[PDB]
Every structure is written in structure tokens, then in C-alpha cells.
Ligand binder design. Structure first.
Ligand SMILES: CC(C)CCC[C@@H](C)[C@H]1CC[C@H]2[C@@H]3CC=C4C[C@@H](OC(=O)CCC(=O)O)CC[C@]4(C)[C@H]3CC[C@]12C
Ligand SMILES: CC(C)CCC[C@@H](C)[C@H]1CC[C@H]2[C@@H]3CC=C4C[C@@H](OC(=O)CCC(=O)O)CC[C@]4(C)[C@H]3CC[C@]12C
Ligand SMILES: CC(C)CCC[C@@H](C)[C@H]1CC[C@H]2[C@@H]3CC=C4C[C@@H](OC(=O)CCC(=O)O)CC[C@]4(C)[C@H]3CC[C@]12C
Ligand SMILES: CC(C)CCC[C@@H](C)[C@H]1CC[C@H]2[C@@H]3CC=C4C[C@@H](OC(=O)CCC(=O)O)CC[C@]4(C)[C@H]3CC[C@]12C
Ligand SMILES: CC(C)CCC[C@@H](C)[C@H]1CC[C@H]2[C@@H]3CC=C4C[C@@H](OC(=O)CCC(=O)O)CC[C@]4(C)[C@H]3CC[C@]12C
Ligand SMILES: CC(C)CCC[C@@H](C)[C@H]1CC[C@H]2[C@@H]3CC=C4C[C@@H](OC(=O)CCC(=O)O)CC[C@]4(C)[C@H]3CC[C@]12C
Ligand SMILES: CC(C)CCC[C@@H](C)[C@H]1CC[C@H]2[C@@H]3CC=C4C[C@@H](OC(=O)CCC(=O)O)CC[C@]4(C)[C@H]3CC[C@]12C
Ligand SMILES: CC(C)CCC[C@@H](C)[C@H]1CC[C@H]2[C@@H]3CC=C4C[C@@H](OC(=O)CCC(=O)O)CC[C@]4(C)[C@H]3CC[C@]12C
Ligand SMILES: CC(C)CCC[C@@H](C)[C@H]1CC[C@H]2[C@@H]3CC=C4C[C@@H](OC(=O)CCC(=O)O)CC[C@]4(C)[C@H]3CC[C@]12C
Ligand SMILES: CC(C)CCC[C@@H](C)[C@H]1CC[C@H]2[C@@H]3CC=C4C[C@@H](OC(=O)CCC(=O)O)CC[C@]4(C)[C@H]3CC[C@]12C
Ligand SMILES: CC(C)CCC[C@@H](C)[C@H]1CC[C@H]2[C@@H]3CC=C4C[C@@H](OC(=O)CCC(=O)O)CC[C@]4(C)[C@H]3CC[C@]12C
Ligand SMILES: CCC1(c2ccccc2)C(=O)NCNC1=O
Lengths: 631, 138, 71, 49
């Protein structure tokens, strides 16, 4: 412990950003400020630093009560059972890449160590970019994160090459030295997109998706037939009792089949989707059909849906990863769909309160319902995001909006110029009124979409046909600038945005594929934690859980493997490390460049030894000639 | 049977599958704007099958250069013959119109242009090989 | 086709198989990677035999010097 | 073993086309019967070879 504290407090070697991290976590913990120059950084502060960088519900072993008790009582009990782990963390923190790569080879749990190192490197890169440090430090930390990610990807490839099932056990087993996490959870917390988008982890996620159903052929349709027809479940083929039991906490066949079917995440997702589609058509029926003083049965079903979904969203806030509620809200705000869902639930509550009053508030509540119906339709893109063709399409549209925004800005400038010019020529005697902005924005915007307003381009005036009103001065500029505006709008800017969308297509498509393959895990583990019952009936499961919580107060899909299987996966991980390192050595030794270099050198030496051989052969020939002359 | 038109027909066949996802996203956005417009501008309708026709009629022709300029923002709630009074929240009907016309005509069609262009080369080579293959069948 | 033409097409098919296999062998033997590898190896051996030649030449030079000293 | 037996004997073209058909058919059958996907990929590779 003291030697590692001395290693963390050294001043030699390269520079590091550890002191800024210690200063920031000390400022956050005790709001002081700048640290003293003669400050000895304890490993407890290193534990807070690891907790801040790793994020989520990560709890470093330094900050646990056992290590703080050992620290209070002392400053082989002071020896670390896994010293290479702490040495690795030390190296990664103070930015010693070669030392970290050496410590990655030696020791067990190399995959979790590599994923933790990739997370730490990305987190310190983001923190160095945020604190306005040198940008080269952030670039080098991102390079170190990518190198550790490539290490983990190659180790995953070797684990998939040797043996599949023990590689799944490597991917799922609980890491007691890494805050009881999982290699998959670490690959998602580190935003490792290449790890999750690997085919082995994708089919692991597919196996996790299907629950205890074998199926896997024309999937989705038989799931829907099982949902709509409850006696259609017994015809489905079910998996074995012990073939791949991923859980979180470690007559009758018909009931077991029903329970295994209705707890499968694909079946639960399609339940939620059919309930959502039914709610959407019940929202359509209440907004198209007229509204009386009191709500109808369909409106009551819609209100019940909205409020149970609101309580379910509050449940997702409360049953999250951190312990402090502000951090729970901050974690929950990463998923933007959940935030817009909460905003829509509050908006529907305001609309319902306005609708339940009398006029002129009932019409306002109807209008708020009609604005909410737009978002509840737009949520079907996230509903369709589970598909392997529609999901990347939605992500691609998401990327394309940022490219559209600059077109919208340039479009706004040109459109506003033509609107101001047309309104300020054709109407020279207007008064201060808010209709001027509407006349600015109305006609040019519909001029973009094939409606040039042909009756009002160049109206005939200043003549007798009924006598027309006299011509406004300079009105002939109004067609001519129209021509320019219609060109720059319809042939320049739209065609440029076509070119922008096409040239950024390929990279955005590949990134959308990897991000969809990454967020498949997020979809699977959110829908595994959700209750079985659909949102309109979710109040039953919720009171069930509240009663279970009160009864208990009165009293990650992992594998939870044993010490024996721990020894097996450690042997597997060492075989994977040796095979990867010596296969890299075989690739390096068999490359054309290294072979040409080794040859060139060998040839270089040869000539030198052969020149020596030629000189000694001349000497031997002279000696043989002298010996022949003597005899 | 032609060596230029045959691969063109096969290429159109491939492009329909790329169009189908645009049709689905198009259907979602079009149905949202149709429901919102019909449910704001007509607050006293009865249960009738004309509501779905009013949902699907106007937004679909809004895609193809006909914005229905007479019914975008009709003048009402004034005396000119006295106009009928303004429906509540009718000013949202132009504004959401703006959003719908953007996402339809500058986002989704341009994205389908990019989809058709990026999947052009592989589909063209596969259409050439499939035409050369089905020449035997012909 | 008849048994005679069957014999002809079987001969054609065997010539095609031998020509394809040994043209693949010619392409593999004339590639840059295989030539570099065969060379590298040949060079590797050369040095080893020439180091043996240098040691035996030192032994022969010592023997010739001893024979010249004796006579 | 199949590539060795392709070299020896007559009717090598029909044997190769029949082998490509059989490999594609067993790849489709392995994909249909929910077997290991690596078997289907290797059978498709054998069909392409
Ligand atoms: C899971 C999904 C794919 C299917 C489940 C949804 C449908 C079964 C629901 C959604 C909308 C419902 C309709 C919404 C409104 C009405 C009006 C309702 O009529 C009245 O309330 C007045 C007239 C009368 O009382 O008959 C009759 C049922 C009906 C057609 C409903 C029938 C059942 C529908 C089609
Ligand atoms: C859970 C939801 C979102 C999807 C599943 C569909 C069904 C479970 C529900 C949703 C809509 C319901 C319908 C909504 C409206 C009506 C009209 C209702 O008609 C009356 O009440 C008129 C007679 C009277 O006034 O008493 C009869 C029930 C019915 C057909 C409901 C039957 C059950 C339905 C089809
Ligand atoms: C009826 C009228 C008002 C037209 C409605 C237009 C907008 C309300 C919709 C149309 C298309 C939608 C977009 C379609 C695709 C996406 C990608 C998708 O983003 C993500 O999946 C990334 C966010 C995350 O999940 O973290 C959802 C937002 C966004 C930009 C949507 C935002 C809302 C948009 C612009
Ligand atoms: C890509 C960029 C450049 C798009 C920018 C366009 C919008 C900023 C403009 C175009 C059309 C405008 C709308 C045209 C008409 C109206 C109706 C207007 O309603 C009223 O004045 C109420 C009384 C009446 O309807 O007469 C309120 C402003 C609004 C929504 C305007 C708000 C601003 C909009 C959406
Ligand atoms: C430079 C670009 C990026 C933005 C330009 C924005 C203009 C379109 C804005 C900015 C100043 C605005 C004006 C500021 C003040 C007024 C007075 C205002 O008068 C009243 O409201 C009086 C009572 C009434 O009649 O309602 C009417 C709108 C108007 C002309 C505004 C019309 C719209 C203007 C020209
Ligand atoms: C990045 C882009 C999409 C930002 C675009 C923002 C603006 C161009 C929009 C947003 C809010 C809009 C305003 C919202 C409401 C009104 C009131 C509206 O007032 C009336 O129509 C008064 C009644 C009448 O006499 O018609 C005039 C347009 C105006 C100023 C809109 C003008 C266009 C604005 C400034
Ligand atoms: C991309 C290239 C091919 C664009 C070329 C188009 C322009 C050269 C044309 C198209 C529309 C024409 C305008 C259409 C109408 C008028 C109004 C006209 O005004 C009058 O005659 C005053 C009295 C009246 O308005 O009746 C003066 C010419 C002008 C500006 C024209 C000028 C030449 C314009 C801009
Ligand atoms: C007059 C109105 C109703 C418009 C008619 C539209 C459709 C009936 C047509 C227009 C273009 C046609 C498509 C043009 C090209 C092809 C490729 C071609 O497919 C093939 O050659 C592959 C099938 C095979 O031969 O095995 C025929 C179907 C399809 C999709 C056609 C299906 C029918 C479509 C959509
Ligand atoms: C790319 C995707 C989003 C296209 C989806 C559009 C269609 C689903 C819509 C658009 C226009 C609709 C049509 C508009 C008008 C009519 C006439 C309507 O005829 C009647 O009601 C008979 C009496 C009369 O004509 O008044 C029957 C429905 C129909 C064919 C509609 C059927 C549904 C259509 C084809
Ligand atoms: C969520 C997305 C994917 C689909 C939304 C589909 C809606 C456009 C549908 C589903 C429920 C339908 C309603 C279900 C029940 C009825 C009652 C029906 O009443 C009658 O037929 C009564 C007799 C008559 O007047 O003909 C009229 C159509 C209507 C309002 C339907 C209109 C079209 C709705 C809103
Ligand atoms: C993948 C995409 C292309 C699928 C699109 C399917 C739906 C969007 C279409 C197919 C059948 C259509 C329906 C066919 C017939 C009618 C009857 C029609 O009834 C009337 O017009 C009643 C008479 C009147 O009062 O006008 C209303 C539209 C509706 C429900 C259509 C609405 C749009 C629907 C559901
Ligand atoms: C409202 C949409 C949904 C849902 C449904 C299917 C897929 C994703 C989300 C739900 O019905 N209840 C729980 N969460 C949700 O937001």
C-alpha cells in the first residue's frame, strides 16, 4: 500500500493530468479548492478519481469500507492479491502507455483490464478537453483508448476462435475486482462500439433477446401470434432448463411455458408495441371525433395509459444506477427519448386539466392533445428502431438533421431578405403591426415547394380593364428579385443539400450501423428490467412490486460463476493472450517489409565475411604456392 | 430482353425495397400531420369514415408541389360577408405545416436520393449478372 | 454426344484440370511474396554454410601455416 | 477431401457444379433449421470455392 502510494506521488517520468483530477474530485467532495503543493495523494483520493472517471454506479475497491478501515489502522494484509491490476490503473492514470501495455500482458482478467483502461483513457481525454489543457494530451489519450479497445477486440476474436461457450462465460462472469460488473457492461460503459458490434456478442444479444424460446426462424410473427392467441404459446419450441441461464439474482409444464414465454424480452417488447399501437389508435379516435363535457371510454383509456406510463418513467428514474437522486436524474437524462416522454406526459396532464374545465379552456386542452399526437406518432421511429433496416435509417436521419440545420440557416437568410424586400416594396404605407413578419415569412416559404403564387407575381395594375389601382413605385423589382430568390432556393441550395447528404452518406451509414448494434444491448437490458404487463395494465405489476417492497421492508444478465470456472476462464484468457501475442509475432516475422529488411541485413554481413574469406583464401593460396616451391 | 432496359427494370426492383422504408417513415410523418390538421381544424366532427380520407388526402398531395395555398391560412374571424369565427389553436396548423413540408421535401426525399445513389453500383452489377443469368431462362 | 466424343471431352477436361492446376502453381511460384520468402530462407541457409566455411577455412589456414613451418 | 477428389476422375465440371449446388442447398437448410451460423457461412464459402 505504501509503495503504491509512493508510486502515485512520484515526480519523475513523463507529465500527467492526475493532479487536476485529484483537485477536481477534492473540490467536488468538499466545496479548499486548489490543493497544497506539499500534498500526499492517498489511494482513497485515487479511488474517488476512479469513481469519477468510470461513472455510473462504479465503486472502486479503494473507497469501500474494508480498504478505508485498513487505511485507518495502518496509516500479507497490506499486500494486494492482484497487484498487476493496481499497477495497470496507476500506469493508465499517469499516462505511461508502454508500462500499461506491459502490465496488460501479465496477470489475469486481461479483458476487463483492457476495457477499464479504454474507459479511463476516454474519460481523461474528455476531462482534458473540458479543462482546456493541451490538445495533444487529449489526442494521445484518445489514441491510448483506441489501442486498448483494439486489444480487447483482438482478445475477443481469439476467444471466439478457440472455444465459444467459455468465451461467453468470459463475457458474462461477474468481476469482483471491478465493482461487481460484467465485461459486456464495461464494453458498453466505455462506448466500445467495435466490441459490441462483433458477431459473437451480437448473437449473444440475440440469444439474450429471445429469453427461453428457441424459435429463431421468422421471428416476431410467432411472438405476435403467441401474444394475441394465448393457446398458441404451447406449440412454440422452448429451450432447455439449463442451456444458457442469464439471470440477475442467483399443468406445471404449461405454467412454466407461459411464464417463460411472457418473461422473454422479445415477447415483452412486442406486448409493449401492440399496447402502444392500440393506445395510438385510441388517441386518434379521441382527437378526430368531437369531445363532450366529460371524457369518453376511449379518452379514459388514453388518460390511464399516459399516467401509468408516467409512473413507469418515474420508476425508471428511481430504479437506476447511482444512489443520489440528482445523479439518477443525470443518468436518466442521457436517453433523450425518456426526457421527451416525460415532457409529453406533463403536457398531456396540462391538456387534460385544461380540458376538464369549461370553455374557453376545453378547446385549449383539445389543441394540446393535437400537439401531443404529433410526438406520439414520431415516437414510432424509436419503436421501429429495433429493426435491422429501419433503426440505422432513423439514426441516419438523425445525423442528416445537423447537415440540414446549416441549410436552414442560409435558407432563412435568403428567405428573410426576399420577404423583407417584397413586403417593403409592395406595401409602402403599412402601420406597425405583427402581420408584417407573417407577410415576410408566409409567401417565400411556400415559394420553395412548387407554389410560386402565380396570381401575385406580376399583377396587372395602373390601367383600365373596372380601373385597377395605380402601380406601386419600383414594383418591377419584385419579379426580378423573385427570379433570383427562386434560383438560389431551388437549384443552388437544395442541390447543395442533396450533395451534402450524399457525400456524408457512407460514414454516417457505417456509424449508424455500429451505434444501432451498440444500443441493441441498451434495448435488451431496458426491456428485460421492465414489468411483464403492458403499460395500460402496468399499475397491477407496480402495486405488486410496492407490496413486495413493503413486505421485504417488514422482513445485469450475468452468469455468477464459481471459483472453479474462474480458474477455467483465467486459463482461457491466458491462452488467448499468448496466442494473440505470438500470432502478432508470426504476422510481423512473415511480412514482406521485415523479410526484406532481415535479408538485406543478412546479405550485408555475408559480403563482409566473404571479403574476409577472399583475403584469407589469397593468403592460403600464397602459402600453398610457397610450400609447393619449397618442396 | 434488352441489354439496357432489362438491368434497368431489375435495378428498379432493387430500389423498391429501399423505397419501402421511406414509405414507412413517410407514412408516420404524413399520418401525424393529417391527424393534427384534421383534429384541430374540425373540432365538432362525428364518427365517420371521411376522417381517414381527410387525414390521407391533403398531406399526400402536399408532397408533390401542391401545398393547397387557398387553405393554408384562410382569413377568418373578421368581417369582409362575415367570415366564420376562428377555430381555437388554428395558428398551429400553418406552423406544423412548415415542419411537415420540410421533413417531407428536403429531408426524406433527399435522403432517398442518397440511398438510391449509394446502392446504385452494387445493385447495377448484380442486375447485370442476374439479367445475364436469366437470359438462359428466357 | 457418343462414347467417342465422350472420350474426347474427358481428355479435354483432364487437360483443362492439369493446365489450371499447374498455371496456379506457376502464379504462386512467380508471386513477389513467395519469391521474397524463398529468397529470405535461401539467404538464411547461405550464411550458416558460409560461417561453417569460414571456420573450416581458418582451420585449413592454420594447417597450411603449420605445414609451412614444418617444411 | 472434396477438393482432392475434384482433381481425380472425369466429369470435373459437372462434379464442381453439383458440389456448388449441394453446398448452397445445405447452407440454406442450415440457415432454415436454426443451426450454427458459422456452418452456413462455411458452406457458402465452399459453394463459392
Ligand atoms: C394491438 C392492435 C394492433 C390492435 C388493437 C386495437 C383495436 C382492437 C382497437 C383500436 C381502436 C378501436 C376502435 C376505436 C373506437 C371505436 C368506436 C366504438 O363506437 C362507439 O363508441 C360508438 C358506437 C357504438 O357504440 O357502437 C366502437 C369500437 C371502435 C370501432 C373500436 C374497435 C376496436 C379498435 C379498432
Ligand atoms: C389496451 C389497448 C390500448 C389495446 C387493446 C384493445 C382492447 C383491449 C380495448 C381497447 C379499445 C377498447 C374499446 C374502446 C371502446 C369501446 C366502445 C364501448 O361502447 C360503449 O361503451 C357504448 C355503450 C355504453 O355507452 O355503455 C364498448 C367497449 C369498446 C368496444 C372497447 C372494447 C375493448 C377495446 C377494443
Ligand atoms: C407533423 C409535423 C410537425 C412534422 C414533424 C417533424 C418533427 C417533429 C420530426 C420529423 C422527423 C423527426 C426526426 C427523425 C429522426 C431522428 C433521429 C432520432 O435520434 C436518435 O435516435 C438519437 C437520439 C438518442 O436516442 O439519443 C430521433 C430524433 C430525430 C432527429 C427526429 C426528431 C423529430 C423530427 C424532426
Ligand atoms: C427552413 C426555414 C427557413 C423555415 C422558416 C419558416 C417559418 C419560420 C415560417 C414559415 C411559415 C410561417 C407561419 C405562417 C403563418 C402563420 C399563421 C399565423 O397565425 C396568425 O397570425 C393567427 C391568425 C391568422 O391565422 O390569421 C401565426 C404565424 C404562422 C404560424 C407563421 C410562423 C412562422 C412560419 C412557420
Ligand atoms: C436580422 C434578422 C436576423 C432578424 C430580423 C427580425 C425582424 C423580422 C424583426 C426584428 C424587429 C421586428 C419589429 C420590432 C417591432 C415591431 C413593432 C410591433 O408593434 C406592435 O406590436 C404594436 C401593436 C400591434 O399592432 O400589435 C409590430 C412588429 C414590429 C414591426 C417587428 C416586426 C418584425 C421585426 C422587423
Ligand atoms: C433555426 C431556425 C429553424 C429558427 C427559426 C426561428 C424563427 C425564424 C421563427 C421562430 C418563432 C417565429 C415567430 C413566432 C410567432 C410569430 C407571430 C406572428 O404574428 C402574427 O401573425 C400576428 C397576427 C397577424 O396579424 O397575422 C408573426 C410571425 C412570428 C413573429 C414568427 C416569425 C418567425 C419566428 C421568429
Ligand atoms: C436562370 C435564368 C435563365 C433566369 C433568367 C430570368 C430573367 C432574365 C427574367 C425572368 C422573369 C423576368 C421578369 C418578369 C417581370 C418583370 C416585371 C416588368 O415590370 C414592368 O414591366 C413594369 C410594369 C408592370 O409590372 O406591368 C419588368 C421586367 C421584369 C422584372 C422581368 C425581368 C427579367 C426576368 C427577371
Ligand atoms: C398506374 C398506377 C397504378 C401506377 C402503377 C405502379 C405499379 C403497379 C408498378 C410501377 C413500377 C412497377 C415495378 C417496376 C419494376 C419491378 C421489377 C420487376 O421485378 C423483377 O423483375 C423481379 C421479379 C422476378 O421476375 O422474379 C417487376 C416488379 C417491379 C418491382 C414492378 C412492380 C409494379 C410497379 C411498382
Ligand atoms: C407513400 C405513402 C405514405 C402513401 C400513402 C397514401 C395513401 C395511403 C392515401 C393517399 C391518398 C388516399 C386516397 C384519397 C382519396 C380516396 C377516395 C375515396 O373515395 C371515396 O370516399 C368515394 C366517394 C368519394 O370519392 O367522395 C376512397 C379513399 C381514397 C382512394 C384514398 C385512399 C388512401 C390514399 C391512396
Ligand atoms: C397508429 C397508426 C399506425 C394507425 C392509426 C389508424 C387510424 C387512422 C384509424 C385507427 C382507428 C380508426 C377509427 C376506428 C373507428 C371508427 C368509427 C367509424 O364509424 C363508423 O363507421 C360509423 C358508421 C359510418 O359513419 O360509416 C368511422 C371510422 C373511425 C373513426 C376510424 C377512423 C380511422 C382510425 C382513427
Ligand atoms: C406500406 C404502405 C404502402 C401501406 C399503406 C396502407 C394504408 C396506409 C392504407 C391501405 C388501405 C387504406 C384504406 C382503404 C380505404 C379507406 C376507406 C376510405 O373511406 C372513405 O373515404 C369513406 C367515404 C367518405 O366519406 O369519403 C377512407 C380511407 C381508407 C380507410 C384507407 C386509409 C389508408 C389505408 C389504411
Ligand atoms: C410509450 C412507449 C413505450 C415503449 C414501447 C415499446 C418500445 C419502447 C418503448 C411504452 O409503451 N412503455 C414503456 N416505455 C415506452 O416509452
Amino acid at each position: 500500500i505504501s509503495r503504491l502510494e509512493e508510486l502515485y506521488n512520484t515526480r519523475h517520468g513523463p507529465s500527467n493530468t492526475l493532479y487536476h483530477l485529484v483537485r477536481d474530485v477534492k473540490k467536488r467532495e468538499y466545496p479548499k479548492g486548489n490543493l497544497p503543493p506539499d500534498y500526499r495523494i492517498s489511494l482513497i483520493d485515487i479511488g474517488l478519481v476512479i469513481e469519477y472517471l468510470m461513472g455510473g454506479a462504479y465503486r472502486c475497491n479503494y473507497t469501500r469500507k474494508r480498504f478505508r478501515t485498513l487505511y485507518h489502522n495502518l496509516f500479507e494484509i497490506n499486500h494486494f492479491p492482484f497487484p498487476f491490476h493496481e499497477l495497470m490503473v496507476w500506469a493508465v492514470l499517469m499516462k505511461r502507455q508502454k508500462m500499461a501495455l506491459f502490465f496488460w500482458q501479465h496477470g489475469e482478467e486481461a479483458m476487463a483490464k483492457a476495457l477499464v483502461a479504454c474507459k479511463l483513457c476516454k474519460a481523461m481525454a474528455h476531462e482534458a478537453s473540458e479543462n482546456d489543457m493541451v490538445d495533444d494530451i487529449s489526442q494521445e489519450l484518445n489514441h491510448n483508448s483506441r489501442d486498448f479497445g483494439q486489444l480487447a477486440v483482438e482478445l475477443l476474436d481469439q476467444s471466439y476462435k478457440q472455444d465459444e461457450q467459455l468465451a461467453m462465460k468470459l463475457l458474462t462472469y461477474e468481476l469482483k475486482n471491478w465493482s461487481n460488473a460484467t465485461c459486456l457492461q464495461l464494453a458498453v460503459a466505455a462506448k466500445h462500439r467495435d466490441f459490441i458490434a462483433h458477431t459473437c456478442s451480437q448473437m449473444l444479444l440475440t440469444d439474450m433477446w429471445m429469453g427461453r424460446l428457441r424459435m429463431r426462424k421468422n421471428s416476431g410473427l410467432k411472438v405476435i401470434l403467441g401474444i394475441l392467441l394465448p393457446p398458441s404459446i404451447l406449440s412454440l419450441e422452448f429451450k432447455n432448463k439449463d442451456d444458457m441461464p442469464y439471470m440477475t439474482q442467483a399443468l406445471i409444464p404449461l405454467g412454466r411455458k407461459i411464464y417463460e414465454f411472457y418473461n422473454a424480452p422479445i415477447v415483452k417488447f412486442w406486448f409493449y408495441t401492440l399496447a402502444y399501437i392500440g393506445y395510438l389508435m385510441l388517441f386518434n379516435y379521441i382527437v378526430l371525433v368531437k369531445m363532450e363535457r366529460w371524457p369518453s371510454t376511449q379518452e379514459w383509456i388514453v388518460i390511464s395509459y399516459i399516467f401509468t406510463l408516467g409512473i413507469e418513467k418515474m420508476r425508471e428514474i428511481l430504479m437506476s444506477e447511482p444512489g443520489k437522486l440528482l445523479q439518477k436524474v443525470k443518468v436518466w437524462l442521457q436517453e433523450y427519448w425518456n426526457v421527451t416522454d416525460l415532457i409529453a406526459i406533463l403536457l398531456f396532464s396540462v391538456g387534460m386539466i385544461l380540458r376538464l374545465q369549461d370553455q374557453p379552456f376545453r378547446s385549449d386542452g383539445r389543441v394540446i392533445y393535437c400537439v401531443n399526437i404529433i410526438y406520439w406518432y414520431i415516437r414510432l421511429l424509436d419503436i421501429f428502431g429495433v429493426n435491422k433496416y429501419l433503426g440505422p435509417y432513423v439514426m441516419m436521419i438523425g445525423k442528416m438533421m445537423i447537415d440540414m440545420m446549416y441549410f436552414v440557416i442560409i435558407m432563412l437568410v435568403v428567405l428573410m431578405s426576399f420577404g423583407v424586400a417584397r413586403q417593403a416594396i409592395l406595401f409602402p404605407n403599412e402601420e406597425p403591426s405583427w402581420k408584417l413578419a407573417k407577410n415576410i415569412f408566409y409567401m417565400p416559404y411556400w415559394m420553395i415547394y412548387g407554389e410560386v403564387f402565380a396570381d401575385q407575381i406580376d399583377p396587372p395594375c395602373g390601367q383600365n380593364e373596372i380601373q385597377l389601382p395605380p402601380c406601386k413605385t419600383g414594383a418591377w423589382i419584385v419579379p426580378a428579385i423573385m427570379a433570383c430568390y427562386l434560383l438560389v432556393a431551388n437549384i443552388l441550395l437544395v442541390n447543395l443539400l442533396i450533395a451534402v447528404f450524399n457525400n456524408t452518406f457512407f460514414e454516417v451509414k457505417s456509424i449508424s450501423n455500429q451505434v444501432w448494434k451498440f444500443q441493441r444491448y441498451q434495448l435488451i437490458m431496458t426491456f428485460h428490467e421492465r414489468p411483464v404487463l403492458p403499460p395500460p395494465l402496468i399499475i397491477f405489476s407496480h402495486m405488486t412490486m410496492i407490496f413486495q417492497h413493503l413486505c421485504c421492508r417488514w422482513r445485469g444478465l450475468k452468469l455468477f460463476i464459481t471459483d472453479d470456472e474462474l480458474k477455467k476462464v483465467h486459463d482461457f484468457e491466458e491462452q488467448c493472450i499468448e496466442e494473440y501475442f505470438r500470432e502478432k509475432d508470426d504476422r510481423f516475422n512473415s511480412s514482406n517489409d521485415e523479410r526484406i529488411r532481415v535479408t538485406s541485413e543478412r546479405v550485408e554481413n555475408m559480403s563482409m565475411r566473404l571479403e574476409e574469406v577472399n583475403e584469407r583464401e589469397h593468403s592460403m593460396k600464397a602459402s600453398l604456392q610457397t610450400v609447393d616451391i619449397r618442396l
